[PDB]
Amino acid sequence: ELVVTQESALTTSPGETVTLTCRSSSGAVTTSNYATWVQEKPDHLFTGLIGGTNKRAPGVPARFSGSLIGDRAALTITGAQTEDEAIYFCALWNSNHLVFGGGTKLEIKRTVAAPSVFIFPPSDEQLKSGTASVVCLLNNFYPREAKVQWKVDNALQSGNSQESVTEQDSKDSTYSLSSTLTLSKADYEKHKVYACEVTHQGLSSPVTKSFNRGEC
Amino acid sequence: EVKLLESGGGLAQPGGSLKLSCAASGFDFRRYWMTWVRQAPGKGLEWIGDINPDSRTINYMPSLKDKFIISRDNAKNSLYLQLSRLRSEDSALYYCVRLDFDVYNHYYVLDYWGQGTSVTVSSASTKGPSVFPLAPSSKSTSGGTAALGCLVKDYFPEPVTVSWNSGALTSGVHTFPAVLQSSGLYSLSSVVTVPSSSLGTQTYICNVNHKPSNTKVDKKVEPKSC
């Protein structure tokens, strides 16, 4: 049962050199595994990078190189650029079938950028349906680590919110996140103050965006 | 100029079958090996199998060797994948991939990939999305930029596509990945920042589309009236 493994994530700074590895659970990776690499950019855009372990694919900048390091196959990016932010997949050929690794998320360090916070009260139309969705938006920040806490009339909520985060923006290398608090129309009407508290490295003190139900 | 376009995805019933197709162009299809790769939710890529030019050699991933059938029609520059005995585990994005095969140099690379076609193996019914407006919590006087958007909630199965002003507006747009709600329904938001001043003059419309339920909605987001 061959299992190809890769480091889940790595972070490097521009101009730096980084190496992603690919190991086999059945032993050392070898030339006969024909290790190959694929890059996944946002929107399910994949592109072949390396083939035959160390041979670059046409159109691939020379900053990319392949090789065997120890018992693993590796992809080395010299002079990392922000355009290199992506997920790199590795695959090994096991005699009669191809096995992909779990992929490595490569992040490119950039300066701290605090998020712009926005809170969206539920729409009237949505309320008619009996449900109320409160949305909180954290826009273009970095690093990704950000804590968003919901408070309904100073009562810290829990278990009733889901969040989504975008891929590191190719341009500014930032992330954007949204947290959605979902309540029954009933509960929503049982409270007044709805606030979103955001904590992030780029903020000296947590930022709170809020609104009082009914207040326009 | 290589182009790979998949089709055939959609909601299917467990135990059922489904035939996916891929249209190719930009290269001598007849001279290349073709490959199918899929990606299930929260998972990485998984090789399904490949087929050589003359269809005389067809390799499959150990497991699906039987419930999966690959074929091609060089005359029509097409690649097919016949799925069968569909189980929830087969729910994934199916990619059509061209394989540059060089046995002389032992160089094998999956160069060009299509963007895939989504396939959901569920017993649930198809449901359309409700599009709610995320009104600009700002005015013109405030000066600067305001955030607004659309909340596409309670639909099934994936995926939904969202654009603004029929594509005219793309800068500042952030369409988050859909989230699976406890209800088993999907939901997502799409926001975008515009200049406060344009609020009241410029019209902001988000165009939501959900093929599975043949839903098409254009919601106009305006500043909530106070």
Ligand SMILES: Cc1cc2nc(N)n(CCCCC(=O)O)c2cc1C
């Ligand atoms: C991505 C990839 C796909 C492949 N499909 C086949 N069928 N082989 C086997 C290659 C031929 C075996 C040989 O002559 O050594 C593959 C190798 C790689 C790296």
